[PDB]
Amino acid sequence: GVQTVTLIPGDGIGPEISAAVMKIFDAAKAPIQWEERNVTAIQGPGGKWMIPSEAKESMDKNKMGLKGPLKTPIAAGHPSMNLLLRKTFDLYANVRPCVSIEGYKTPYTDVNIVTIRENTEGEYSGIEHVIVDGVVQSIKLITEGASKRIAEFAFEYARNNHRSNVTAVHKANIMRMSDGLFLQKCREVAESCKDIKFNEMYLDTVCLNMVQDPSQFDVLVMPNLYGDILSDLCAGLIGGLGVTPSGNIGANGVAIFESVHGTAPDIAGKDMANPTALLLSAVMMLRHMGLFDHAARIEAACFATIKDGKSLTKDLGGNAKCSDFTEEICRRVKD
Amino acid sequence: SFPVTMLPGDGVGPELMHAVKEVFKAAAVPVEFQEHHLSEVQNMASEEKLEQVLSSMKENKVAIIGKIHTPMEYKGELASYDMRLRRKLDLFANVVHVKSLPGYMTRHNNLDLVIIREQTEGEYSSLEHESARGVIECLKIVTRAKSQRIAKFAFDYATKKGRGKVTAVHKANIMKLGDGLFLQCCEEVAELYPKIKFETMIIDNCCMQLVQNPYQFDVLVMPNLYGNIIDNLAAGLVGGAGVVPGESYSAEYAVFETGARHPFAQAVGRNIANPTAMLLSASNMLRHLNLEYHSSMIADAVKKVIKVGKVRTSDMGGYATCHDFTEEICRRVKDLDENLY
Ligand SMILES: NC(=O)c1ccc[n+]([C@@H]2O[C@H](COP(=O)([O-])OP(=O)(O)OC[C@H]3O[C@@H](n4cnc5c(N)ncnc54)[C@H](O)[C@@H]3O)[C@@H](O)[C@H]2O)c1
């Protein structure tokens, strides 16, 4: 049949690249009905920020999601709608794969890396308050049960996708109790899976080793104590924010696929944004849904365009409009 | 004529310090080192030995140090003697020099970068406690008093060293009250420095930018959001932990160290370490002591020995030994004395 999926066009360069991936999916006869829904910060009755009700009933019905980036005030205002979205649907695994693009040459060759980050605790414990004048205190909490659920996710991912190694990336030398628990739970799941090789590294070691040689790494698992800056380091390895895709995975096959990048305000509206990121997340969603043939087709179209280099885009090689780039992929998918 | 506190630390620290002084000996450097052997791993640690070090600093006001190792069984790093030192010395600004070495080829050549981060709060303020059967809570603090001090230090450093622009790296999009306070404290002290450019950037973007196109930045000031992670990322751009030098400052004290200090920084055996980071910081130290001739001489001797490519250690892709490499820098540093013009 024809399955539907909730689309959130988002803010900034969101609506452009959303339109860009819808066209490539239209051009591919992809059996997918978009349900365009808007998510802005509506403030609930008790002051607690809530999603738009139209958006939540949409996600509950479809349990699949492709969203663009959302603006979050870079000073004060509403809390990030992405943290809110991830927690209200309990998408506890954030999966970010960095693989090099064969057509696009970069100082780093043949990187293949999956960053599995826990997606609901840590700095997503939104409690942060003022103690006295000019003194701010933040309270983050990690639970045992979440540490175990992400380590199990990580090891299952390593098995479902035929990855040989898993590395727990921790700061247990400095955050004894928190990361000591995460390592404690990572180690238990590792004993039940001798087929996957396990090791632990300190995050500061990993960052240094990564920019020197990513070929040492396979899947990396992390608590949400240090943000998503390891996969931002990884994003630069393969070509920046225009190409790195994302997935927020939950249980019972619920997921919201987005990209690592943000609203891109400096380029917003100028029809110069790169839609490879959101496109590659949408082929993540496709392979999640089992539409494997539409996936390989759309993905081959995208890479073969990047490889031709004729109609690239400003974040990559040369100047061509997002519209121009989306069209040369549409031309590729149909043939 | 010039006393300096030396703290060899654990690991290869004693080898690096032996490199600094056999070079300093070969260059007739007028510096007398006061060594304190403070090692918790070897059972030479106590708070009386900590105090003997502050006494040495109260007189010398300048120290070159290794890494005091901490035993991960029964101690996290916050209670390590390496933290008690920085608190007793009130070191608050960490300064890392990410500068390419001509002849040590990496993927980011011709790079000239400095990272300033705050060293007394954020992560190093962490208080952890257990709220439930299996729930851990970490408490962190940010303050205006300590953000103003580090942003002022950054612009002072920027003018004093002729640097052009200062980027403030923050995560005030999700840590609104905490890091917006630091961001504000930065924009306030930027108005007092009109000859210095100033911009901000969300921390997610900066890491991507450091590995994609690091040449944009010049001076990075940031809070202790995530510890030494960025210093270690950036130090990978330019050769890694055996080359990147670092200094930590107080209101009165200057402590010169290495810049990349992950727990396995040069976890090598008895003659395999690279003295470049330590030797460069020693020369940076001499500059601070206003011995600008000796400071410049050492630094040129080391920069030139690795441009020729003859003697190279393992990390630099070579089979030479730490003694081989220092004996070559002493060979070149004594030539540079006898033929100075
Ligand atoms: N929805 C999300 O997942 C998400 C993630 C990060 C940031 N944001 C939000 O957006 C803002 C972040 O903006 P920022 O400037 O710090 O980072 P950004 O990711 O929006 O962009 C930073 C840099 O990369 C460029 N860039 C980003 N995406 C690009 C693309 N698809 N194609 C070509 N160039 C691209 C931008 O032009 C800019 O130079 C904040 O409000 C923040 O809360 C949202």
Residue numbers in the entry:
A (entry chain A): 3 to 337
B (entry chain B): 14 to 354
What does the paper say about this structure?
Human NAD-IDH is a key enzyme in the TCA cycle, which catalyzes the oxidative decarboxylation of ICT into α-KG. The α and β subunits form a heterodimer (αβ), and the α and γ subunits form another heterodimer (αγ), which are assembled into a heterotetramer (α2βγ) and further into a heterooctamer (the heterotetramer and heterooctamer are also called holoenzyme). Our previous biochemical studies demonstrated that the αγ heterodimer alone exhibits a high enzymatic activity and kinetic properties comparable with those of the holoenzyme and can be activated by CIT and ADP but inhibited by NADH; on the other hand, the αβ heterodimer alone exhibits a low activity and cannot be activated by the activators but can be inhibited by NADH. Our structural comparisons show that the αβ heterodimer has a similar yet more compact overall structure compared with the αγ heterodimer and contains a pseudo-allosteric site that exhibits substantial conformational differences from the allosteric site in the αγ heterodimer.
